[PDB]
Design goal:
Chain lengths: 8, 273, 101
C-alpha cells in the first residue's frame, strides 16, 4: 500500500 | 536485503491546466505500480506481471490513496510557493521518496520519508522516525505543522508496520522475478580507429540487479582514469546494461583484461581479446 | 526551478544489432531536473510514430530518468537518432544511434 501523504 | 520504494512527483504547469502528479512503486530494482493524475478517472495500475493477481480491493484502495495524495500535493504546491513568495507564473516541483529496507530476518533495517522542492532537499524524516529535519527557513513552516499534527508517528507506524508486511507479500508473489540474480552476458568488441590505435569495449548485458562492477586492467594495473565507463541503463525488458571502453595501441590488445563482478556470477569474470 | 540539471542521453538497442531481425531502439534520458522533457526518436531525420516511454521516476539526488523505446528492425544504412529538448538546453540535443555503443 501507499503510505499516507502529508500536506506541506 | 530487499526494499519497497515509492517515488512521487508533483509539478505545476502555469497556463496548461492543473498540476500533475505521478507516483511509481518499486520492489528493489523492479517497478510494479504507477499512478498518473493526467488520466481521466486515474487509477493505480499494475506494472509487473506478478502483482496483477493482487486482490481487486488492493487496486481500489491504492487508487483512492493516490488520488488523495494528488489532491494534497496540488494544494501543497501552492503552500510551498507561498512560503518562498515565488511568482505564480513559474513551474515548481514537489518530490517524495519513502519506503523501507528489510533484512534477512524479515524485520525493518531502515525506514525513510524525504521530500524535495525544485530538486533540493526540503524536509526529511529523521532516522529515529520521530522528528523532522527541515532544509531551510521556509521548510520550517512545514516542520512546525507536521510536528503539531503528529505525522511522524503515522510514518513510523507505516514504515515499521504495513511497509514491511507489504514488501514481504510482494517478494513472495513475485519471487521468480524479484529473487533472481541474472548474471551479465559479457563480451568484448574491437573497433579500429587507425593503424596504430583501436577501441576495446567490454560489455555487460541483460543482468539483474542493477549493481555491477566493470573494470579494465593493463597487465594487472587498473585503468579507471583512462577508461570510459557509461552509466548503467535499463534494457527495456526488466534488466540492465553497461559497458567500459578503452583506447589501446594496435598491437597491444592482448595486454588488457576486462573484469566483471556481479551477484549472479559464481566467480568474477576475466575477459581478454 | 532553483536547481536545474541538463539530461544525459544514451541511445542503444535492447539486443545487439543484427540486420533484418526485430529489436528495440532505446533512448535513455537521466539526471535532469525539472521533469518536463521532449524526447523524439528519428528515422533518417523524421520523428517515429509509435514511441512509448517508461513511467517517470528519479534517483537518489532527485534527478529524473525516463526510457523511451520503439520496436524497430535495424538495417545497414538506415540512420537512427534521439532528439532531446529540455529547459536547460538552449538548443535540442541529437544523439545518433551507434550499434557499437
Amino acid at each position: 500500500d501507499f503510505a499516507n501523504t502529508f500536506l506541506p | 536485503f530487499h526494499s519497497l520504494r515509492y517515488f512521487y512527483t508533483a509539478w505545476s504547469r502555469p497556463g496548461s491546466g492543473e498540476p500533475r502528479f505521478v507516483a511509481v512503486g518499486y520492489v528493489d530494482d523492479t517497478q510494479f505500480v504507477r499512478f498518473d493524475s493526467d488520466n481521466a478517472s486515474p487509477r493505480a495500475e499494475p506494472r509487473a506481471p506478478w502483482v496483477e493477481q493482487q486482490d481487486p480491493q488492493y487496486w481500489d484502495r491504492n487508487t483512492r490513496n493516490a488520488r488523495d495524495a494528488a489532491q494534497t500535493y496540488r494544494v501543497g504546491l501552492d503552500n510551498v510557493r507561498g512560503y518562498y513568495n515565488q511568482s505564480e507564473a513559474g513551474s515548481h516541483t514537489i518530490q517524495r521518496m519513502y519506503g523501507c529496507d528489510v533484512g534477512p530476518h524479515g524485520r525493518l533495517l531502515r525506514g525513510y520519508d524525504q521530500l524535495a522542492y525544485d530538486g533540493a532537499d526540503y524536509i526529511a524524516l529523521n532516522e529515529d522516525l520521530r522528528s523532522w529535519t527541515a532544509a531551510d527557513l521556509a521548510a520550517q513552516n512545514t516542520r512546525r505543522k507536521w510536528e503539531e499534527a503528529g505525522y511522524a508517528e503515522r510514518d513510523r507506524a507505516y514504515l515499521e508496520g504495513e511497509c514491511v508486511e507489504w514488501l514481504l507479500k510482494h517478494l513472495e508473489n513475485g519471487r521468480e522475478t524479484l529473487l533472481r540474480a541474472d548474471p551479465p552476458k559479457t563480451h568484448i568488441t574491437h573497433h579500429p580507429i587507425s593503424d596504430r590505435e583501436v577501441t576495446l569495449r567490454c560489455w555487460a548485458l541483460g543482468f539483474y540487479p542493477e549493481e555491477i562492477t566493470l573494470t579494465w586492467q593493463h597487465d594487472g594495473e587498473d585503468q579507471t582514469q583512462e577508461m570510459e565507463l557509461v552509466e548503467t541503463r535499463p534494457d527495456g525488458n526488466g534488466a540492465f546494461q553497461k559497458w567500459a571502453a578503452l583506447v589501446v595501441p594496435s598491437g597491444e590488445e592482448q595486454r588488457y583484461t576486462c573484469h566483471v563482478q556481479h551477484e549472479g556470477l559464481p566467480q568474477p569474470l576475466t575477459l581478454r581479446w | 526551478s532553483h536547481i536545474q540539471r541538463t539530461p544525459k542521453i544514451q541511445v542503444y538497442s535492447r539486443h545487439p544489432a543484427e540486420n533484418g531481425k526485430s529489436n528495440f531502439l532505446n533512448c535513455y534520458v537521466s539526471g535532469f531536473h525539472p521533469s518536463d522533457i521532449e524526447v523524439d526518436l528519428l528515422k533518417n531525420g523524421e520523428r517515429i510514430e509509435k514511441v512509448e516511454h517508461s513511467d517517470l521516476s528519479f534517483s537518489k539526488d532527485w534527478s529524473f530518468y525516463l526510457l523511451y523505446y520503439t520496436e524497430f528492425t535495424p538495417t545497414e544504412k538506415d540512420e537512427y537518432a534521439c532528439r532531446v529538448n529540455h529547459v536547460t538546453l538552449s538548443q535540442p540535443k541529437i544523439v545518433k544511434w551507434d550499434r557499437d555503443m
